[PDB]
Amino acid sequence: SDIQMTQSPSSLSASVGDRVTITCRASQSVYYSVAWYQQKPGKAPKLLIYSASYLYSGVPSRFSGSRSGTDFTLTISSLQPEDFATYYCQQYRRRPITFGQGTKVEIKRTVAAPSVFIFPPSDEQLKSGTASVVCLLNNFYPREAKVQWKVDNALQSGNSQESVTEQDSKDSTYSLSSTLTLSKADYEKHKVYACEVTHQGLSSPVTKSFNRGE
Amino acid sequence: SEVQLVESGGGLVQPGGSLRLSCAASGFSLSSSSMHWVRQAPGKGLEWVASISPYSGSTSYADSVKGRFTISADTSKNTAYLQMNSLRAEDTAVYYCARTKYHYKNYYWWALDYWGQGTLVTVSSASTKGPSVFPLAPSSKSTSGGTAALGCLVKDYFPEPVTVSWNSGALTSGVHTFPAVLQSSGLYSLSSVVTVPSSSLGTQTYICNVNHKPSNTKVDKKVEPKSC
RNA sequence: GGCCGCUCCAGAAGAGGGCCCCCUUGCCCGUUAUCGGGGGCUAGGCUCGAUGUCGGCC
Ligand SMILES: *[C@@H](C)[C@@H](O)CCCOCCOC(=O)CCCC[C@@H]1SC[C@@H]2NC(=O)N[C@@H]21
Structure with a gap:
C-alpha cells in the first residue's frame, strides 16, 4: 500500500517579489519525510528542502518548508525571476517513494x-x-x-x-x-x-x- | 568535489525491444550512495523506476517494471546501469539518474540530492517518416487590427523533433511553433504560425523552413494568400 | 469430586500477526538501513499459549 502525494494547484501565477506557497497533501502520515524539488524546462530537478523544512546545501533562504498534519507547504518568501519553474513534493517515509504531480509557478501579467x-x-x-x-x-x-x-x-x-x-x-x-x-x-x-x-x-x-x- | 552524473544509452526502440542505460558518476563513490532511475514522460511528472545500493547490492523496482528492468552497478567504473527489456510505448520518457549520498551517522536513505541531465527513451512501432507540410493561408476575411495570421501545418512525421524557421530565420517576431502532439496513428503533428501586417501580404513572401533530421528532410513551403 | 494433560469439542481465552495516529529518530537501539516510546483499533479466521463448557486416568 503506497502513499500518494497530491499537489495543488497545478499552476499559479505570481510576480517577482510575491510570497508564494505551494501545498502537497500526503494520503496518510509521512511524519516529516518529505522533500521538495525545483525543475526548469528541459533540465533535471534540483533538491531544495528535505525532512519537510531543512534547507539543502546552497539553496537560498527565501525557500522554506512546513508541515501541518499531512499537508506540506513550500513557501518562497519573495519570488525571484529565476524561481519561475515547476515544484515537486516527494515522500520517503515508506517505499516506494512517490511524487506529487507538480505545481508550475508562472508569470502574472x-x-x-x-x-x-x-x-x-x-x-x-x-x-x-x-x-x-x-x-x-x-x-x-x-x-x-x-x-x-x-x-x-x-x-x-x-x-x-x-x-x-x-x-x-x-x-x-x-x-x-x-x-x-x-x-x-x-x-x-x-x-x-x-x-x-x-x-x-x-x-x-x-x-x-x-x-x-x- | 564536483558531483556529476552523465547518462547515456537512450534512443528509439520498438515495442518488445531492449535498451541499456548507463549513468557514469564522478565526484563521489557509488559505494557511498544510493543510485536511482526516475523517469518523466513528456509533459508529465516524475516517476521512480528503480534504486540500487552498490555497497550492498540491494535493489528495488517500481511494480510496473519488475521482471523487465534490472538496475546494476559496476563500482570499478563508478557507473550504474538500467537494463530495460520488453519495452512498450508507455515507457517513453526522459530517464534521469540520481544519487542519494550515504551518511554513516544517519539511519535510512533520505532524498534524491543530485540528478543527472537525463537521457531520452522513445518506444514506438512507427516507422521514420518526414512530415507533410501544408499551408495555413491568410484570407481577406481574416484580417484583425491590421494583422494577418499564416502558418504551416507540419503533419505525420516520426520521430521527434522538427524545427521550423520562417524566411530562413529572417522572420522571428510573432512566430509561435506549437509543441508536437502524438496522434493516435503514432505519428506527430504540429503547426507553426506567425502574425504579420495584413497590408504586407501582396509585397512580402512568407516561407516556412521545416527540418526533420531523422529523415534528412529540409522542406521550404511558400505560404501565400488565396484570392476569392 | 481428585490428579494428569491438550489428542479431538467450546469460545468463556491472551500473546504473535495486521491497520491507523503523535513525537524531526526523542533511555538504549538502527543491516549502505527508518527506529523507539506512547496512543487508537482488529477475536476466535492461522500459530503458540491458557482455560473448561473438553479428553484420559482414579
Ligand atoms: C495476537 C496477539 C493478536 O492476534 C491478538 C491481538 C490482541 O487484541 C485482542 C484482539 O485480537 C485481535 O483482534 C487480533 C486478530 C487476530 C489476528 C490473526 S493474525 C493471523 C490471522 N490472519 C488474520 O488476518 N487474523 C488472524
Whole structure:
C-alpha cells in the first residue's frame, strides 16, 4: 500500500517579489519525510528542502518548508525571476517513494484576449485524403480558454487536439492551436466550420468560421 | 568535489525491444550512495523506476517494471546501469539518474540530492517518416487590427523533433511553433504560425523552413494568400 | 469430586500477526538501513499459549 502525494494547484501565477506557497497533501502520515524539488524546462530537478523544512546545501533562504498534519507547504518568501519553474513534493517515509504531480509557478501579467484565426484545410492536404482544420488563439492571458468546434452547427467531440505554448519570453502570453482532423469524405459532407473561443479577456465568446468551398 | 552524473544509452526502440542505460558518476563513490532511475514522460511528472545500493547490492523496482528492468552497478567504473527489456510505448520518457549520498551517522536513505541531465527513451512501432507540410493561408476575411495570421501545418512525421524557421530565420517576431502532439496513428503533428501586417501580404513572401533530421528532410513551403 | 494433560469439542481465552495516529529518530537501539516510546483499533479466521463448557486416568 503506497502513499500518494497530491499537489495543488497545478499552476499559479505570481510576480517577482510575491510570497508564494505551494501545498502537497500526503494520503496518510509521512511524519516529516518529505522533500521538495525545483525543475526548469528541459533540465533535471534540483533538491531544495528535505525532512519537510531543512534547507539543502546552497539553496537560498527565501525557500522554506512546513508541515501541518499531512499537508506540506513550500513557501518562497519573495519570488525571484529565476524561481519561475515547476515544484515537486516527494515522500520517503515508506517505499516506494512517490511524487506529487507538480505545481508550475508562472508569470502574472495583465489580462489579454486572444486574437482568433481559423484555417481551412489546404487543397494539397485534401488531395492526400485528410482535412485538418486549424483554429489559432494568439497571445492571450491567462491560460484558461475554451475552444469549441462546430460543424454545420453540430458541436464536435473527440476529433480535435490542442497544443499550447509555454509563456512567451517577451510578453508572458500563451498561444494555442486546436486542430480538427476529419477524413476528406467527412469534411465534404458539411459546409460550415466554426471555432468558438471563450476567454476572460472577451466580453462574450468569439466565433471564427468559414464555408467549405468559399 | 564536483558531483556529476552523465547518462547515456537512450534512443528509439520498438515495442518488445531492449535498451541499456548507463549513468557514469564522478565526484563521489557509488559505494557511498544510493543510485536511482526516475523517469518523466513528456509533459508529465516524475516517476521512480528503480534504486540500487552498490555497497550492498540491494535493489528495488517500481511494480510496473519488475521482471523487465534490472538496475546494476559496476563500482570499478563508478557507473550504474538500467537494463530495460520488453519495452512498450508507455515507457517513453526522459530517464534521469540520481544519487542519494550515504551518511554513516544517519539511519535510512533520505532524498534524491543530485540528478543527472537525463537521457531520452522513445518506444514506438512507427516507422521514420518526414512530415507533410501544408499551408495555413491568410484570407481577406481574416484580417484583425491590421494583422494577418499564416502558418504551416507540419503533419505525420516520426520521430521527434522538427524545427521550423520562417524566411530562413529572417522572420522571428510573432512566430509561435506549437509543441508536437502524438496522434493516435503514432505519428506527430504540429503547426507553426506567425502574425504579420495584413497590408504586407501582396509585397512580402512568407516561407516556412521545416527540418526533420531523422529523415534528412529540409522542406521550404511558400505560404501565400488565396484570392476569392 | 481428585490428579494428569491438550489428542479431538467450546469460545468463556491472551500473546504473535495486521491497520491507523503523535513525537524531526526523542533511555538504549538502527543491516549502505527508518527506529523507539506512547496512543487508537482488529477475536476466535492461522500459530503458540491458557482455560473448561473438553479428553484420559482414579
Ligand atoms: C495476537 C496477539 C493478536 O492476534 C491478538 C491481538 C490482541 O487484541 C485482542 C484482539 O485480537 C485481535 O483482534 C487480533 C486478530 C487476530 C489476528 C490473526 S493474525 C493471523 C490471522 N490472519 C488474520 O488476518 N487474523 C488472524
